[PDB]
Amino acid sequence: HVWPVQDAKARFSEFLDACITEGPQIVSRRGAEEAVLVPIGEWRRLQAAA
Amino acid sequence: MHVWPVQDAKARFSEFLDACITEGPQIVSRRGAEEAVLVPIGEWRRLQAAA
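YS: structure for the whole thing
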């Protein structure tokens, strides 16, 4: 579930489907986490739960 | 919370990621419907801890 930047770009459609079918997918740059793609409903729900 | 169609987030991935970090969560759409959001990782971790 951690994708190097170049992999998240080259396989972006797979990265987005994995987000929706498996859960949040992290993007890393040179092995350091940078961002995470979160399904939109889950994002909204987390904001309400926080 | 700018919205990027899937093909545009892919083609301009570096810009999409940069906007996430410099401006905040960026939405990705398919078929003109919001599907997911790219969130700075630190913001996500703090959200997780608070929920």
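YS: worth flagging: Residues 2-51 of chain B form a domain with the YefM-like fold fold (CATH 3.40.1620.10).
IM: good catch. Also Residues 4 and 28 of chain B are 5 Å apart (CA to CA).
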